[PDB]
Design a protein around this ligand. Structure first.
Ligand SMILES: C[C@H](NC(=O)C(F)(F)F)[C@H](Oc1ccc2c(cnn2-c2ccc(F)cc2)c1)c1ccccc1
Lengths: 13, 247
């Protein structure tokens, strides 16, 4: 649930 | 480095729609392109939020919560500013290659959604909103709604939101007006922030219907489908506390 958003917040930019 | 300057440097780049102007317009074509472009705007909005001072200090769940509630508020407001700066007319500057003008506005059902976006750019133009006031206001829109039972880091959130409310006050004082004019401007700009809840409610009513009715064949990219899928049950369970400056 909300896989993409959690990935974008957790990855290093 | 001042706080407002840290909000300024993280302003997202201008994205292009990839809209082929050689093929004629249609509402379905424009709406589909704008939804695809909106997904890319929302991916850029996560990168943006992560660089807002204090945002990363909130619980990861609160970071997800705030972006999911505020997504359309951020987009409508960023679009309003972009439109206010680039045209001064009844024009929506979604992308340099995809501008919604009067001719495009007459397309079936185009206006019923676009008018809510036009209200935003109209109000920024009417209030002569400055760049620094706009940056503070946009960060405040990210912090404009919380869950019914609050955030995991509610105490820290209330401190961060107060900091950005004080930032808005500092941007207002720079307009070199008197104490009475400053208080009037604070009232006017926070009234516009309050009204963004209604702007978004109208946008989401149409957006939620379009997403749910699969017979319309209106595609949403993964980023938007995921936010809408998350948000629809939150609204039906009354799981939303809309923060207001005025009563
Ligand atoms: C998800 C929405 N779709 C629907 O409501 C519909 F119509 F499909 F149901 C879509 O939402 C947006 C909102 C802002 C957008 C985009 C794409 N880019 N931008 C944008 C451009 C410049 C900025 F500065 C900021 C954001 C999509 C929209 C499409 C058409 C009319 C109104 C809204």
């Amino acid at each position: 649930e909300n896989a993409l958003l959690r990935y974008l917040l957790d990855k290093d930019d | 480095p001042t706080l407002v300057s840290l909000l300024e440097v993280i302003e997202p780049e201008v994205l292009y729609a990839g809209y082929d102007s050689s093929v004629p317009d249609s509402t379905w074509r424009i709406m589909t392109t704008l939804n695809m472009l909106g997904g890319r705007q929302m991916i850029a909005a996560v990168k943006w939020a992560k660089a807002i001072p204090g945002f990363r200090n909130l619980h990861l769940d609160d970071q997800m919560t705030l972006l999911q509630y505020s997504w359309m508020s951020l987009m409508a407001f960023a679009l309003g500013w972009r439109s206010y700066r680039q045209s001064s007319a009844n024009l929506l500057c979604f992308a340099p290659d995809l501008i919604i003008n009067e001719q495009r506005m007459t397309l079936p059902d185009m206006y019923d959604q676009c008018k809510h976006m036009l209200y935003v750019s109209s109000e920024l133009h009417r209030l002569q909103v400055s760049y620094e006031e706009y940056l503070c206001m946009k960060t405040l829109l990210l912090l404009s709604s919380v869950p019914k039972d609050g955030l995991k880091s509610q105490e820290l959130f209330d401190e961060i939101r107060m900091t950005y409310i004080k930032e808005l006050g500092k941007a207002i004082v720079k307009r070199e007006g008197n104490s009475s004019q400053n208080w009037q401007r604070f009232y006017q700009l926070t009234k516009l922030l309050d009204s963004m809840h209604e702007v978004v409610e109208n946008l989401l009513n149409y957006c939620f219907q379009t997403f749910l009715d699969k017979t319309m064949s209106i595609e949403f990219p993964e980023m938007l489908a995921e936010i809408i899928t998350n948000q629809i049950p939150k609204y039906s369970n009354g799981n939303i506390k809309k923060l207001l400056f005025h009563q």
